[PDB]
């Protein structure tokens, strides 16, 4: 890559909480921020702009693809859309990435060059969403209401924490390109939470950022496996009721497994930040 | 000049009106009852801050048409690719017009003019969302440890007043077009304007409010917020083309362009605002509202 630090991170941050997301969480954030004596509200900042930035990267990498857009010119949409999020992130728990940014718009010998840097700190900023994802509480609500039978390769999900194990296949014929690079990062130990708006799912951050075509997509089957690429490269389990690119689904047998671990993410995220594991591994 | 004319009609109507979306979020009524476990803060949390972010994308994305460094095709792409993710959420967490007006900001344009007045208009009715959704979002829900005008002509600056009622208080301040020619005379353009007053809830002690009005001009006399004096006056076009009024000390290091300043006379009254606005946003959710006219 064009800076090789920002990968050590990223192998660092699977496994463990990035020293930023801590310092957020606790209120040891420098700079104090938050207003009138609390933090709370530059934790939601912290949590929401370094999301919705990551989805920017991330469109930024697909754009950074397409040929009918100037390397230079797409330098100059990052150059604008940029600092307004990485600015504020520097001063909100988030420094380092700003330094990165900064890099990312230095300019590119190569088409390849920004795209690499993009795909990097992308990935570093998702990872970096992931945990604030896992650690933001959101318990305050108060506000209470086809294809091949050979082309499906044998999969194994894997909870430690929770103990609970299943099979499944991915579909390497529906999303071809989407499959072969989950597949080269398979096989991945990763953290996994709950997804905290559409319903009864889960998604855990994978280690990969791919533009792949999605061609084949669908409604968001109990245990459905969909990953999806906008939202952070997130593999989804689909453990009850709710369109994202399918990547398979877990054997119907070790389907009813997965409920206990639906509660036990949902609590994962909510309340305990207490970590469930997910390991994805070829069969 | 407008391409579209009711989006106009909505901007209008909102600065005084709360707006149907944003009262659908507050009290929960949204038919897609979004969260999960059966409640709407994280439906709620993410509405906001998207919308907030979503509309810091379209300000870029004006920004971006006003340069022709970069060409429209190529700007349409840009936003063809960055905008479907957010506004299709958006349609789906309680804002199903802005996803509409999304799909027909980003048809092909003539004429960059004509994309770039889609921005503009776009920009600002999300502007008037994120600012309803800024007053009416629950913060009062983690506590921490207790423990520059000299430039230019004063022979040019412009006095205005700035009022908040209910409350009744008033101030009498000053705009430097000579530190910021196109940014001082685009908010005495938008002037008379009566807007709702909130409080910021992470730099310091401050209050902003969204002023109906989106420049793009490039400021030339920025300024460290932590470094800006009791009385200063801030426009931040990338937060929402908002006129900010700092009350005390504020923690940001951000630069933001300078717009003038409340006379030495009045800033003792500035005080009293700020404690106000800032319940105003945290707890009773009380419309301030700031009434900005020339003098
Ligand atoms: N809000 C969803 C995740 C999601 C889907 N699409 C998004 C777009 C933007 C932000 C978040 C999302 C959840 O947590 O259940
Ligand atoms: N600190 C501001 C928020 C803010 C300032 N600069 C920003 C840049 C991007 C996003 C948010 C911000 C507040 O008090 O609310």
Redesign the interface.
């Known amino acids: 890559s064009a800076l090789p630090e920002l990968r050590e991170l990223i192998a660092s941050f699977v496994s463990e909480e990035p020293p930023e997301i801590r310092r957020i969480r606790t209120?040891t954030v420098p700079?104090?921020?938050?207003?009138?004596?609390?933090?709370?509200?530059?934790?939601?900042?912290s949590?929401?702009?370094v999301?919705?930035?990551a989805?920017?990267l991330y469109?930024?990498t697909?754009?950074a693809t397409?040929e009918?857009?100037?390397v230079e010119?797409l330098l100059?949409?990052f150059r604008?859309?940029d600092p307004?999020?990485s600015?504020?992130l520097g001063?909100?728990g988030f420094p380092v990435l700003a330094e990165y940014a900064q890099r990312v718009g230095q300019p590119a010998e190569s088409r390849a060059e920004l795209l690499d840097r993009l795909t990097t700190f992308t990935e570093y900023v998702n990872r970096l969403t992931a945990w604030s994802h896992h650690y933001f509480p959101?318990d305050?609500?108060?506000?209470?209401?086809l294809g091949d039978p050979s082309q499906r390769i044998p999969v194994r999900l894997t909870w430690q924490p929770l103990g609970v194990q299943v099979d499944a296949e991915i579909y390497a014929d529906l999303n071809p390109q989407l499959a072969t690079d989950v597949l080269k990062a398979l096989p991945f130990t990763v953290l996994q939470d709950?997804?905290?708006?559409?319903?009864?799912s889960m998604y855990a951050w994978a280690p990969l950022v791919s533009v792949a075509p999605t061609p084949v997509r669908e409604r968001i089957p109990v245990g459905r496996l969909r990953f999806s690429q906008?939202?952070g490269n997130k593999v989804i389990v689909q453990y009850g009721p709710t369109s994202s690119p399918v990547l398979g689904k877990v054997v119907d047998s070790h389907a009813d497994r997965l409920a206990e671990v639906g509660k036990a993410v949902?609590e994962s995220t909510?309340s305990s930040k207490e970590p469930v594991w997910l390991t994805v591994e070829r069969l």
């Open positions: 209120g700079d104090l921020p938050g207003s009138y004596g609390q933090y709370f509200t530059a934790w939601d900042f949590n929401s702009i999301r919705d930035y989805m920017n469109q930024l697909r754009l397409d009918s857009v100037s010119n100059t949409v604008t859309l307004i999020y600015t504020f001063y909100n959101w305050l609500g108060r506000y209470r209401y709950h997804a905290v708006v559409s319903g009864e906008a939202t949902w909510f």
